[PDB]
Design an enzyme around this catalytic site. Structure first.
Site, PDB file in Angstrom:
ATOM      1  N   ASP A 250      21.034 -57.832 -15.256  1.00  0.00           N
ATOM      2  CA  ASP A 250      22.269 -57.097 -15.508  1.00  0.00           C
ATOM      3  C   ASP A 250      23.469 -57.930 -15.085  1.00  0.00           C
ATOM      4  O   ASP A 250      24.588 -57.707 -15.545  1.00  0.00           O
ATOM      5  CB  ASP A 250      22.273 -55.758 -14.769  1.00  0.00           C
ATOM      6  CG  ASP A 250      21.490 -54.689 -15.498  1.00  0.00           C
ATOM      7  OD1 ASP A 250      21.273 -54.843 -16.719  1.00  0.00           O
ATOM      8  OD2 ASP A 250      21.100 -53.692 -14.856  1.00  0.00           O
TER       9      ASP A 250
ATOM     10  N   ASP B 257      13.966 -49.727 -21.822  1.00  0.00           N
ATOM     11  CA  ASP B 257      14.556 -49.804 -20.492  1.00  0.00           C
ATOM     12  C   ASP B 257      13.849 -48.912 -19.470  1.00  0.00           C
ATOM     13  O   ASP B 257      13.112 -47.994 -19.833  1.00  0.00           O
ATOM     14  CB  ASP B 257      16.035 -49.426 -20.569  1.00  0.00           C
ATOM     15  CG  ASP B 257      16.844 -49.995 -19.426  1.00  0.00           C
ATOM     16  OD1 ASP B 257      16.239 -50.542 -18.481  1.00  0.00           O
ATOM     17  OD2 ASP B 257      18.087 -49.888 -19.470  1.00  0.00           O
TER      18      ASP B 257
HETATM   19  O1  LIG Z   1      22.185 -47.627 -18.763  1.00  0.00           O
HETATM   20  C1  LIG Z   1      21.892 -48.675 -19.637  1.00  0.00           C
HETATM   21  C2  LIG Z   1      21.715 -49.963 -18.854  1.00  0.00           C
HETATM   22  N1  LIG Z   1      20.476 -49.945 -18.119  1.00  0.00           N
HETATM   23  C3  LIG Z   1      20.184 -51.206 -17.464  1.00  0.00           C
HETATM   24  C4  LIG Z   1      20.198 -52.344 -18.475  1.00  0.00           C
HETATM   25  O2  LIG Z   1      19.801 -53.537 -17.870  1.00  0.00           O
HETATM   26  C5  LIG Z   1      21.575 -52.404 -19.089  1.00  0.00           C
HETATM   27  O3  LIG Z   1      21.701 -53.513 -19.929  1.00  0.00           O
HETATM   28  C6  LIG Z   1      21.830 -51.123 -19.837  1.00  0.00           C
HETATM   29  O4  LIG Z   1      20.940 -51.013 -20.886  1.00  0.00           O
END
Ligand SMILES: OC[C@H]1NC[C@H](O)[C@@H](O)[C@H]1O
Ligand SMILES: OC[C@H]1NC[C@H](O)[C@@H](O)[C@H]1O
Lengths: 718, 718, 143, 146
Positions: free
Chosen positions: B539, B469
């Site tokens: 997201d 991430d």
């Molecule tokens: O803080 C974690 C968060 N970061 C952003 C990601 O897209 C989410 O799925 C998650 O992993």
């Protein structure tokens, strides 16, 4: 902490947000206050970083700004960018102080709209500052009283101990809260300048720009945001005009959140500017006009402003002379005999000015030599410039001269004596455009030479008109007189030198009407208009082609500056055969003149010239100084139409044009604008019509066949 | 003197023009030869200067080029720009030699499309050079045999004796003869990445870019030229995809003569690169695709190419596991007890993988700390990572882990020990996004630390899945381990470091399925796909919202890499309440998984998940590796529809969606694509239909009310 | 379709207001809002039914719908705004009004005082809001 | 007898026709619209209100065609399908500005709201009782009021 500028019937609102950030609030129809200036949702926008880590709702990426930078949480294109000695490009301008004074200041070495009295305008200077590097940026805002005009420019100053290299220095930048607009710019080329192109905004970057060291024919330094339903007569329009004749960037950027960043200034591409401690940089100004009365409303504001408060000299408010130009008539092949011989006829036709074009100096029997050698050709003109003007003046005609002082031919005495006086870079082949090179106006010696040389030539003969031309764009940009770290300042320094050259020459010769030119309208911009009150609109002199060209040019620039000449057919640029009647009607819709060989004209055509010249003299004040309304756009169909209206609306002149003939066509009608509805108008040779009738109902047009037709009616109140 | 590249059913044609100038000729449907490549009018274009003063018909401003430069008779946006020590930016690349070899080369420290056999593609390297400065530029062209794919990239090398600073180094550039096209790019934001935007071309500059040090949610590195009438099923399309995960510029420039210059590469803004004598620079590659089968034809070419010849690892051709993520379920509030407690039910529901998200390391109870300290929080996980993983495997489930190695929190042991390891510039406030700072991956010590630390963590437990991430965009871009004249190389050196870091970590752990992430599809680019075979799409996990997102994503990227999870309702991003059936159908249209609280579900809901999981397993190969067709667009109406077709067209899966229900609605119909017309199909749960009937006539859809509905049918050949 | 009672009320108040539903099946919360809805409409009934109607945003052209009712002397106004499909991370929304006296300042109940010329020429920033099928309604009174 | 009425305070012109047979033979009205007007030009869009049950009176903006366009009802009622109303609007006319010409039929039965554009760019707008399936017989002395 709110700044409020009232320009005409418009408002421009700014605000200090948090710890010294300059935020944009509103620009449009005038308001008393914007109470909801800070009443907006403070949102945490993902991936929009924070100057203050504690507050995620604050981000320069999500703040409407007046002079934004890149590096500290803003990811949109910045208004400026400075690189430090340590290599970083992070700057941070915060509010230091401000000052408000009546009137309008001069820009250092740059053209700018002006005032004759203090009450005509008011100026707000916002002094920003970056304490770490000692960078002071003063934002100059001027609001005119009578017009919806806001002008903007920025003045950098290094008050630090280190060197600052400006990578970008745009004149202004404004963030609109929404982006549901179209945008109009003026693209084109040689022989077809300033075509109106309307496009919807994209989510990303759109830009019209010039990398040609000139404003260019390809893209005119002007863009505009228009409302979706805005037309010529109604709707909200935001204009952006650049008072600069060199490289420019006119950009609109739409971000993820539907905001539109409009920025304009000297093109950052291939551009830097070193600032030693104590040195300063002044950007040219951008004239920003708002209107809720469509494109006509916006254009008319520009027309009055640029004609009365930008153009200068004794001929500013003077009716412009009806001239004859010999370029398309004879080109280089001419002599003193053929010019004096035809001058007799010209005076009898009503012509007021004879303009001697390219080919009088050096060995100019072609376009491949002699540029820089501004001495009279004795084989072509035995009695010299003074002798020719003498024989012309005694026939009641004025004399005019052609010059291209910014250029130097490789085959010339100037280039043999001063090979380094041109724009060039070490050990690179010197590319040529029209077999010539560009003079280094970045240099003081080159400029001083031109200033002295040209001033003497124009004073060596009773000359009252000068055509300043330029037929090349800059290549291999560089200067021998500049250090390596300042080589990218060459283009702007060239334009600064040119502005300095013109300002001194035009000052020495107040009795001379100067007309700027550049292969037609290659430099038709507010910058040139400041030094020369009129411009050669386009080398394309075709009646039909000029419909689009003059229509688009009128969007920003006043008719008084829009040179238009009646030429010969078949047209030398398109080969189109249009009647002398229609050629006249087109040219009489601008700064009227002729450019054709009278010896090759039939007796019927010669007779029509006398009638045309007499006609334009009756409407010259009306055409050149009256209010201009566009009615039918040649970009939107088979027709073109416009009209000129006097200040008291007592007189008017209407012009109509149809290009392609239609068999068994529908009846044509034309609705007018700008007339007094509470009054009747007599249409000469057509009858009396109601003012309300002509605007609300319209008037039936005569049915006519044949291609490329035109109609002109003089309107008078009863 | 004509280079001809044959990619699939397409042709890319180039030619040497005059004195070694490389010129573009043609790109489109495959032809044997372009015999009229030189049979075009040679014109003297005004204000277009000439490298040869005698021949005004030749100009770089009017030449269709492959890698153009500014400064010597070309005024359009250049593909590159070099500043010499003397301050000049004039360069002159001419032809030297060229080589042709089977296969495809790797790019130095960069991701690129590859081949497993020499026969799959051929490579043409045209060597250009500027003799004066010793600059050699190798233009790399590669054409695949089975796909209509031309990949382009450039390689610089300073063989001279002076320093050379690359101010601009785009991967490719191409000049189309005409400009009568629309252009498509993929603008967006967090929670709504890659919306399809169709716009007409303007005469000037239109561009989509990123200045965020990441490919960004705001603008995906992809632009396309399409015919005015080209749709999803027919018409000519020209795709441009950037294999890079950092800053980029994707620009289209239409000049005065109606030619369209498409250029793509590393964003020149805030970018330089110094080349000492002997040093080199390799650009990332741009994958260019042609199709006459519309947008589907283009996408399907990208899909096969990117899935099988860009993605790597042992999972490239393997079916992806149906996982469950806990991020929306528990966020930061979880423990070891809560995970294995629900893991019992997860196993019985058919789930194959349990992914532990953010909150496991350091003291992550917030998103305000611990980034950089990659040790297991014993408070949350008493038995550690090894303990949690083993309890998962014994239930017949794989174990996955979330990491964000590119970041560092100010509140961490790493930052307190190494505060100079972050991206920063001297004496400036260190801006934070989501209360964190970006690590300086330009430094070798930082990268080496990450490679060792992360590899050890992922080897400390039976982990077979990793979610990589990144939740911030670079600000105050600078490196303490770089000289001032290389500070603007930081952003690219960062991406090189990240590539190096990812390449070595995934090499130490070949048994782990890596999925890239960046607050969703923040870096859903071909560059990231090369190192990690799948990506978290967005997201935004709303079924209706995912319609646009997944539709737009499929334009370039394969379904196999398009992660999609079924989340709870009301949705966490938009608060929309859609049926579980709908959310399943949307998610099963991509890489299927789950991300919601199971404990909060009802009994009838858990039985549907069991059916959803079982259903997806039965069509997983079809969805992830079949041919994808877009049928109805949610960007053009209230509906959204697509389908998956097996390689032999004997098996198919059709998905239909209708957002807002209208009362007393007209009958709905759906026409299919990519089926065998000479064969009948049995729509499971509807009846037997002809292949030609489904494509030519369509199928009457069952009438139903309520909002946010969905229909899914499996199709089998008789 | 399932829409909130507040928006159902706000839509029905934009016309000849009334009710048509099983009250016995309503929850306690729903009956409370219903009583406030009835009382509120009675205060603006003359304005809505006999005032000047202005359309602002068309549901045939986008995701929104907005209109307002202006009294004869332009001293009162009722503004209604509607947003159908919610988009994540949405741009800030704005609403420009019509038919007000620009020379007068208007009080928006709850929010505050805004200029008539400001409400028409510049517009007013709308609150960011999630969920589908939302509605907002403001009473305006000349200062 | 063509009936024209102009209101003072409103931009309202109302129109209707009154037929009367003062001859010796009987006449058959095959068509009897309430009004008709020929516009000199036809560069307009037109707006009508098509719909159905559960979705009446949706706004439909369309450009004019060179030929015949019409909204009508054959249902013995003004219907949910097409509201008895059409409008000629300027190409740039919106909710707040521009010239609009509204045509509203004060009748609850069958109607015809038609705009015809001829070979010479004129626009004929006519409205009234739908001629389809309609006739009316006037005996000597009888009258018909539209
Ligand atoms: O803080 C974690 C968060 N970061 C952003 C990601 O897209 C989410 O799925 C998650 O992993
Ligand atoms: O070369 C002369 C020529 N140059 C271009 C100008 O626009 C023409 O009017 C003429 O002066």
């Amino acid at each position: 902490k709110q700044f409020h500028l009232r320009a005409g019937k418009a408002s421009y609102v700014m605000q200090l947000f948090r710890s010294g950030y300059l935020a944009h609030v509103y620009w449009g129809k005038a308001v008393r206050d914007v109470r909801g200036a800070r009443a907006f949702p403070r949102l945490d926008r993902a991936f929009s970083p924070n100057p203050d880590p504690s507050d995620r709702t604050f981000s320069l990426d999500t703040l409407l700004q007046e002079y934004p930078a890149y590096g500290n949480t803003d990811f949109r294109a910045p208004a400026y960018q400075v690189q430090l000695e340590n290599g970083s490009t992070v700057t941070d301008l915060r509010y230091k102080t401000h000052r408000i004074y009546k009137g309008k200041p001069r820009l250092n070495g740059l053209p700018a709209t002006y005032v004759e009295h203090e009450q005509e305008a008011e100026t707000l200077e916002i002094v920003l500052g970056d304490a770490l590097i000692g960078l002071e940026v003063t934002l100059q805002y001027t609001a005119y009283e009578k017009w919806n005009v806001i002008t903007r420019s920025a003045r950098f100053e290094n008050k630090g101990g280190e060197r600052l290299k400006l990578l970008r220095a745009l004149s202004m930048s404004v963030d609109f809260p929404t982006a549901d607009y179209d945008w109009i710019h003026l693209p084109g080329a040689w022989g077809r300048e300033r075509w109106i192109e309307r496009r919807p905004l994209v989510t990303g970057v759109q830009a019209a720009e010039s990398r040609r060291g000139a404003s260019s024919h390809q893209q005119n330094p002007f863009i505009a945001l228009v409302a979706k339903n805005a037309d010529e007569h109604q709707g909200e329009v935001y204009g952006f005009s650049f008072v600069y004749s060199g490289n420019f960037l006119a950009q609109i950027e739409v971000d993820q959140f539907g905001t539109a960043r409009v920025s304009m200034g000297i093109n950052p591409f291939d551009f830097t500017w070193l600032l030693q401690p104590g040195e300063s940089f002044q950007t040219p100004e951008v004239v920003m006009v708002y209107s809720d009365q469509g494109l006509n409303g916006m254009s008319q504001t520009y027309h009055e402003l640029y004609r009365t408060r930008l153009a200068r000299g004794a001929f500013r408010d003077r009716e412009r002379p009806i001239l004859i130009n010999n370029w398309e008539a004879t080109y280089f092949d001419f002599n003193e005999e053929k010019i004096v011989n035809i001058a007799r006829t010209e005076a009898e036709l009503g012509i007021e000015l004879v303009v001697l074009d390219d080919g009088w100096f050096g060995e100019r029997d072609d376009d491949r030599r002699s540029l820089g050698d501004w001495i009279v050709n004795r084989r072509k003109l035995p009695n010299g410039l003074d002798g020719l003007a003498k024989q012309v003046n005694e026939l009641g005609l004025q004399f005019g001269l052609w010059v291209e002082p910014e250029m130097v031919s490789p085959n010339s005495e100037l280039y043999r004596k001063h090979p380094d006086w041109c724009l060039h870079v070490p050990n690179r082949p010197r590319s040529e455009g029209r077999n010539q090179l560009v003079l280094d106006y970045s240099r003081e010696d080159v400029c001083d030479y031109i200033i002295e040389t040209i001033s003497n030539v124009l004073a060596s003969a009773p000359i009252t008109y000068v055509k300043w031309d330029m037929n090349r764009h800059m290549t291999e940009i560089g200067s021998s007189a500049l250090p390596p770290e300042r080589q990218r300042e060459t283009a702007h320094r060239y334009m600064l030198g040119l502005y300095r050259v013109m300002d001194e020459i035009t000052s020495r010769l107040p009795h001379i009407l100067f007309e700027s030119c550049s292969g037609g309208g290659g430099r038709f911009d507010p910058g040139m208009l400041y030094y020369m009150p009129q411009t050669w609109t386009s080398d394309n002199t075709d009646a039909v082609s000029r419909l689009k060209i003059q229509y688009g040019t009128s969007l920003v620039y006043p008719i008084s500056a829009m040179g238009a000449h009646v030429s010969a057919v078949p047209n030398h640029q398109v080969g189109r055969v249009a009647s002398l009647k229609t050629r006249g009607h087109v040219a009489m819709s601008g700064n009227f003149g002729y450019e054709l060989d009278i010896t090759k004209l039939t007796e019927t055509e010669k007779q029509m010239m006398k009638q045309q010249v007499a006609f334009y003299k009756d409407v010259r004040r009306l055409v050149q100084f009256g209010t201009f309304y566009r009615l039918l756009s040649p970009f939107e169909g088979n027709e073109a139409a416009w009209m000129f209206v006097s200040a008291d609306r007592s007189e008017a002149l209407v012009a109509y044009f149809r290009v392609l003939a239609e068999a068994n066509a529908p009846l044509s009608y034309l609705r007018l604008k700008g007339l007094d509805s509470n009054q009747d108008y007599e249409i000469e040779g057509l009858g009396v019509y109601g003012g309300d009738e002509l605007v609300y109902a319209g008037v039936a047009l005569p049915y006519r066949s044949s291609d490329f037709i035109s109609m002109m009616w003089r309107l008078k109140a009863v």
